[PDB]
Amino acid sequence: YTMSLGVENSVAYSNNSIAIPTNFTISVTTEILPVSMTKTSVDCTMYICG
Amino acid sequence: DSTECSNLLLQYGSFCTQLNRALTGIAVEQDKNTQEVFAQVKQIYKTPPIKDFGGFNFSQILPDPSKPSKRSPIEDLLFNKVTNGLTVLPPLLTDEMIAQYTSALLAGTITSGWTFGAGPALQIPFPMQMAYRFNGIGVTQNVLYENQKLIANQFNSAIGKIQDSLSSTP
Amino acid sequence: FCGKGYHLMSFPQSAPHGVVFLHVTYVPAQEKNFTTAPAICHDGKAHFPREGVFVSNGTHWFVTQRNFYEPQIITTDNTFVSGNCDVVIGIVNNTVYDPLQPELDS
Numbered sequence: 001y002t003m004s005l006g007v008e009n010s011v012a013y014s015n016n017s018i019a020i021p022t023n024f025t026i027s028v029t030t031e032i033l034p035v036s037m038t039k040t041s042v043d044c045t046m047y048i049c050g
Numbered sequence: 051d052s053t054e055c056s057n058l059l060l061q062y063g064s065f066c067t068q069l070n071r072a073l074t075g076i077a078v079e080q081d082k083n084t085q086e087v088f089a090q091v092k093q094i095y096k097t098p099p100i101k102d103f104g105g106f107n108f109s110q111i112l113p114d115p116s117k118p119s120k121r122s123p124i125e126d127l128l129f130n131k132v133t134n135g136l137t138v139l140p141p142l143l144t145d146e147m148i149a150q151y152t153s154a155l156l157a158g159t160i161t162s163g164w165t166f167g168a169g170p171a172l173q174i175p176f177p178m179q180m181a182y183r184f185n186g187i188g189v190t191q192n193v194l195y196e197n198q199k200l201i202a203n204q205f206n207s208a209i210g211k212i213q214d215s216l217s218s219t220p
Numbered sequence: 221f222c223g224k225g226y227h228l229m230s231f232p233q234s235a236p237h238g239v240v241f242l243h244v245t246y247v248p249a250q251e252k253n254f255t256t257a258p259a260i261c262h263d264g265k266a267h268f269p270r271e272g273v274f275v276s277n278g279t280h281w282f283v284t285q286r287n288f289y290e291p292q293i294i295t296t297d298n299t300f301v302s303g304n305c306d307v308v309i310g311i312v313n314n315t316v317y318d319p320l321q322p323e324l325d326s
């Protein structure tokens with residue numbers, strides 16, 4: 001299928017109306033970031049020739 | 051198509067697998083880059099049919115209904131100004147869907163300010179949003195409200211100058 | 221940069237060859253419509269909110285903070301006066317309470 005980019009949402013814009021929040025949600029989200037790799041060393045002479 | 055060449059090429063091992071894997075990683079990385087840049091909203095926002103924004107004109111950046119590509123005049127100008135075993139993979143996001151993502155971002159930032167980026171889109175009049183931005187940079191709301199027509203005229207003139215500068219500079 | 225929503229704080233957690241950030245953010249919810257105006261016209265003067273926004277529930281005008289609904293009476297302590305009512309587009313007429321008025325009234 002052709003993908004849907006997002007759920008449709010039409011904001012009710014007018015020149016004299018505002019939307020004010022009456023409540024809140026404390027949301028905890030995860031962010032995973034790699035920091036380091038495995039430290040590898042290769043003996044070039046031993047690898048090529050043994 | 052040489053069988054003997056491929057038989058001799060098999061003696062060198064998995065070089066071809068490494069090169070194909072690296073190219074595949076680059077190819078998926080480009081799609082990941084496009085997702086990271088443009089697909090930051092999960093709601094497709096749309097502008098109201100009446101473009102009453104207190105004097106602010108966004109026709110040069112909003113999508114043109116007359117064009118089949120549904121691009122803005124600025125985006126249309128940008129697209130006009132950019133011109134043996136190899137294959138070119140198409141991008142995952144086509145140009146019209148990327149334009150739709152930019153249109154959703156424009157509609158969100160015009161009708162809701164920065165509220166849609168942090169949660170639900172909360173509607174606010176655009177002059178009041180501009181006044182909030184003025185307060186963000188340390189200028190009082192009264193300055194924005196008193197000089198609203200001048201600010202709108204300056205904004206429209208600057209947007210027109212941007213379109214002219216893009217159309218006039220190679 | 222530090223999670224989706226208005227960022228409050230973050231927690232680091234060690235991971236094998238990596239770090240996991242638990243971003244604690246504030247998300248607005250349960251929004252409600254209100255009728256808004258840029259300024260309040262009182263005594264031939266234009267009043268603008270110091271830190272909030274003018275809202276109306278249909279009959280009465282209040283001033284509230286932008287990210288949470290907490291209606292308060294429009295007074296001289298939370299508004300400032302700049303100019304008359306002839307310049308601001310969309311200014312509405314409403315009274316502005318004075319806290320000092322009952323003090324000299326009594």
Ligand SMILES: *[C@@H]1O[C@H](CO)[C@@H](O[C@@H]2O[C@H](CO)[C@@H](O)[C@H](O)[C@H]2NC(C)=O)[C@H](O)[C@H]1NC(C)=O
Pocket residue numbers: 010011012013019251252253
């Ligand atoms: C604020 O008012 C507007 C319009 O008065 C509401 O927008 C309507 O929402 C309903 C519910 O989905 C839709 O069916 C209508 O089509 C919307 N109208 C328009 C013009 O967009 C809006 O939902 C109200 N906001 C709140 C928080 O109640």
Ligand SMILES: *[C@@H]1O[C@H](CO)[C@@H](O[C@@H]2O[C@H](CO)[C@@H](O)[C@H](O)[C@H]2NC(C)=O)[C@H](O)[C@H]1NC(C)=O
Pocket residue numbers: 022023024025250
């Ligand atoms: C704001 O939202 C919170 C939850 O996000 C509401 O708390 C809930 O209230 C209902 C009824 O009072 C309880 O049954 C739930 O158990 C509560 N949940 C939690 C997590 O405490 C709170 O009432 C809402 N406040 C307003 C004014 O809408």
Ligand SMILES: *[C@@H]1O[C@H](CO)[C@@H](O[C@@H]2O[C@H](CO)[C@@H](O)[C@H](O)[C@H]2NC(C)=O)[C@H](O)[C@H]1NC(C)=O
Pocket residue numbers: 101107108109
């Ligand atoms: C917003 O700006 C556009 C573009 O500058 C205006 O469209 C122009 O309208 C005049 C008169 O209607 C025409 O002579 C121009 O040729 C139009 N320009 C283009 C590029 O189409 C538009 O009128 C402005 N105002 C609104 C409310 O949209």
Ligand SMILES: *[C@@H]1O[C@H](CO)[C@@H](O[C@@H]2O[C@H](CO)[C@@H](O)[C@H](O)[C@H]2NC(C)=O)[C@H](O)[C@H]1NC(C)=O
Pocket residue numbers: 277278279280
């Ligand atoms: C808007 O809010 C105000 C303040 O909460 C409402 O005024 C109160 O209305 C109740 C119900 O009639 C009265 O008992 C109170 O005495 C009123 N307070 C004041 C200070 O007048 C007002 O009615 C609300 N408007 C709407 C349309 O809901």
Ligand SMILES: *[C@@H]1O[C@H](CO)[C@@H](O[C@@H]2O[C@H](CO)[C@@H](O)[C@H](O)[C@H]2NC(C)=O)[C@H](O)[C@H]1NC(C)=O
Pocket residue numbers: 261313
């Ligand atoms: C808000 O109050 C002002 C001041 O009284 C009103 O302006 C008056 O409007 C009437 C009729 O339009 C004129 O005859 C007066 O000369 C105006 N006075 C001034 C000082 O301008 C204004 O119309 C009121 N607005 C609303 C919506 O009630």
Ligand SMILES: *[C@@H]1O[C@H](CO)[C@@H](O)[C@H](O)[C@H]1NC(C)=O
Pocket residue numbers: 015016257309310311
């Ligand atoms: C909103 O637009 C209407 C015209 O549709 C106008 O009468 C009204 O004064 C405007 N309000 C503001 C606050 O600009």
